[PDB]
């Protein structure tokens, strides 16, 4: 048997973090109070703008529906 | 670039076909007027009861959402 996964590539979009949040790639704070980084619309990964270029494109998550 | 796909295993459920439908595995008619076979709830594959055991479990479809 198998889980069902949604498999694609990340879809990053600038996001307004309402509390201090860290880059899921590098571990440093997403600096500032607005538009601090990007959140993947599909899997929720948070990255610095600069880290968008560093992450693997692979985007998967378990579909728990 | 990558499509987004849902990737899992088939989820077959007995189905009552309304019009003449063929087995997606073997090509023979799904005989009868009721419960003629099974349809995968995820990808729509149609199979005879006897062909359920013959198909690969892999179930994928492109999510066009
Ligand atoms: Zn993602
Ligand atoms: Zn970072
Ligand atoms: Zn299927
Ligand atoms: Zn068949």
Swiss-Prot record, chains A, B:
Zn finger (Phorbol-ester/DAG-type) location: 10-59
Name of this protein: Protein kinase C delta type regulatory subunit
Residue numbers of the full-length protein present here: 231 to 280 of 674
């Amino acid at each position: 048997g198998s889980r069902r996964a949604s498999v694609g590539s990340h879809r990053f979009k600038v996001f307004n973090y309402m509390s201090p949040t860290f880059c899921d790639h590098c571990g440093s704070l997403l600096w500032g109070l607005v538009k601090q980084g990007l959140k993947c619309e599909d899997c929720g990964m948070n990255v610095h703008h600069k880290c968008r270029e560093k992450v693997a494109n692979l985007c998967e998550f378990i579909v728990t529906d």
